[PDB]
Design a protein around this ligand. Structure first.
Ligand SMILES: [Cl-]
Ligand SMILES: [Cl-]
Ligand SMILES: [Cl-]
Length: 370
């Protein structure tokens, strides 16, 4: 557009909430969010994606097929975003697509990360160039491949004179530390965000999530369970660190609970919420005892989580990223649009102090719509 610099960002989280699609203008000083869209993952594709953890079921062939399917769903998400915003595909510079994570294993001897959602398919079915596959360059340089939001967070949320934490509560929670001086930006996965509280409410209540943490609020934390969960070696690891689904998952949880079979389900729920809150708070208080905390992702909307976090961080002012003018629901999609913009402009996006990569590098691959 006319002094517009339109990018699309596409993110499909590990929690299966859908493909989030954002149309962002980066021509100005702050990102301007133009339009948003969530594309529902159809249940046949949801089941396929779940099967990728079922051994002896032709998982590689299934991966290749679903990579195509996810690509088609990401393109549909783009096209539905264009139908609601009514901006021509030709006005879009590039799509920044995270894809959908299937494996994240940065700490194997030979480290790797695996996102599907074929960027050739997205480019073909949208008519817009695609920048995708952002994590693998960071891994190639010895990094965790994650989090990648911190450089975006520094540019968008940092305030000279203020120590800020940006906390994204997805399946896994990650913090960005923005010290508010010459000092380096930090960031890492603290541990579980919503992944375990979601798994437990799905198991017991067959709801997809615990709305506003109200079920957690009805229960009482078991201190023995909490202490045991918090003793996982992951929480004692130094940053840079990230984790996917290999540590905090249903199988792990079920084995953790195999002495607490007679606990009330709502007490387990409360305890799992506290695992998230306490692991996050502990990490934040190691960076600074006082500051400003800005929350984004699904957990920003959980009022029980937010007040528990408030009680744990009395020296913090606590808000969602809304206070900094960025919708908590859309923050992560915007970051991926920003990642495409960085590529477009030939600029690096990872940070060595964040991921452990040996240097800042240009992230992603470009797939032509032509
Ligand atoms: Cl399938
Ligand atoms: Cl086709
Ligand atoms: Cl990230």
């Amino acid at each position: 557009g006319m002094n517009k610099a339109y990018y699309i960002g596409l993110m499909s989280g590990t929690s299966m909430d859908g493909v989030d699609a954002v149309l962002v203008d980066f021509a100005g000083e702050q990102p301007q969010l133009i339009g948003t869209h969530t594309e529902t993952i159809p249940t046949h594709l949801l089941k396929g994606l779940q099967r990728l953890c079922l051994p002896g079921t032709d998982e590689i062939n299934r991966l290749g097929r679903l990579d195509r399917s996810v690509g088609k769903l990401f393109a549909l998400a783009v096209n539905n975003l264009l139908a609601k915003t009514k901006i021509a595909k030709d006005e879009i510079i590039a799509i920044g697509s995270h894809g959908q994570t299937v494996r994240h294993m940065p700490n194997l001897e030979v480290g790797f990360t695996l996102q599907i959602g074929d960027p050739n398919t997205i480019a073909t079915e949208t008519g817009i160039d695609v920048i995708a596959d952002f994590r693998r360059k960071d891994i190639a340089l010895g990094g965790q491949g994650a989090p990648l939001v911190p450089a975006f967070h520094q540019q968008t949320f940092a305030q000279v004179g203020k120590k800020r934490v940006i906390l994204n509560i997805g399946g896994i929670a990650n913090i960005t530390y923005l010290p508010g001086n010459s000092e380096e930006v930090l960031g890492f996965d603290t541990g579980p965000g919503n992944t375990l509280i979601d798994a437990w409410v799905q198991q017991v209540k067959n709801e997809s999530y615990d709305k506003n943490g109200a079920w957690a609020a009805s229960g009482k934390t078991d201190p023995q369970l909490l202490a045991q969960l918090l003793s996982h070696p992951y929480f004692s690891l130094a940053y840079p660190k990230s984790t996917g689904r290999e540590l905090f998952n249903q199988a792990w949880l079920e084995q953790q609970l195999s002495a607490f079979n007679q606990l009330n389900e709502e007490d387990i729920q409360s305890t799992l919420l506290d695992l998230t809150c306490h692991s996050i708070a502990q990490d934040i208080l190691k960076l600074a005892q006082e500051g400003e905390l800005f929350v984004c992702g699904g957990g920003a909307f959980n009022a029980e989580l937010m007040q528990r976090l408030a009680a744990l961080l009395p020296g913090y002012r606590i808000d969602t990223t809304s206070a900094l003018g960025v919708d908590p629901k859309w923050a992560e999609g915007i970051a991926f649009a920003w990642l495409a913009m960085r590529y477009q402009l030939g600029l690096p996006a990872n940070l060595p102090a964040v991921t452990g990569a040996s240097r800042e590098a240009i992230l992603g691959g470009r797939f032509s719509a032509k």
